[PDB]
Amino acid sequence: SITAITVENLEYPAVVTSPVTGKSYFLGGAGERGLTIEGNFIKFTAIGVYLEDIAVASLAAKWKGKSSEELLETLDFYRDIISGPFEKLIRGSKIRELSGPEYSRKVMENCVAHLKSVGTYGDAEAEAMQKFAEAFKPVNFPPGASVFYRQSPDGILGLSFSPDTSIPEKEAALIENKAVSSAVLETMIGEHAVSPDLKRCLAARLPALLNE
């Protein structure tokens, strides 16, 4: 009953299933990301956020019967999405070929920013971020290539790279650290998140579901 979303010709299936956890997620939102070079916005990748099907039951309690605008304006709503007792899956597909180290540099920057910001950037998180970086080094993302972030509610971040746009069956690395595990999503729909495109999709699509 939920639609799919195509971003720059890169398609995001309405629903999906993890070959790693066997769980099922539904599309929460999609969008684009890039760089602004002298006023001009140059797109580089498409991003999508999937929420485990059980996420609805969880969110029902506090958000069933809210308006797409009430949601969009309430931070607590997104905190619940970020740190909800379910798995979240984030798929980044490239529009412009970037190397593993190239792509990772910025996101890692935002993750460290968020972590030092909320006072949770210790030796553990630093090392976790080095492992994070380490996993991208041997990789390259030609157009259409994807990166999958599996955010386990158990404080683990699953990392897997795909040559195309389908979910790889094995994960490249597992980052075991609570703070870091949510950092990535935090930089996309958190309070201090730039581009509201994903927040808007979430606020627009969830209401329907939270009623059935």
From Swiss-Prot:
Keyword Transcription regulation listed: no
Gene3D superfamilies (alphabetical): 1.10.890.20, 3.50.70.10
Entry EC no(s): 5.5.1.6
Enzyme class: isomerase
Domain of life of the source: Eukaryota
Keyword entries, A-Z: Flavonoid biosynthesis, Isomerase
Residue numbers binding substrate: 45, 110, 187
SS bond partners: none
Pathways per UniProt: Secondary metabolite biosynthesis; flavonoid biosynthesis
Activity at various pH: Optimum pH is 7-8.5 with 4,2',4'-trihydroxychalcone as substrate, at 25 degrees Celsius.
Biological process (GO), any one: flavonoid biosynthetic process
Family according to the record: Belongs to the chalcone isomerase family.
Summary of the function given for this chain in its UniProt record: Catalyzes the intramolecular cyclization of bicyclic chalcones into tricyclic (S)-flavanones. Responsible for the isomerization of 4,2',4',6'-tetrahydroxychalcone (also termed chalcone) into naringenin.
Note: Part of the biosynthetic pathway for all classes of flavonoids, a large class of secondary plant metabolites, many of which are brightly colored.
Protein name: Chalcone--flavanone isomerase 1
Protein source organism: Medicago sativa (Alfalfa)
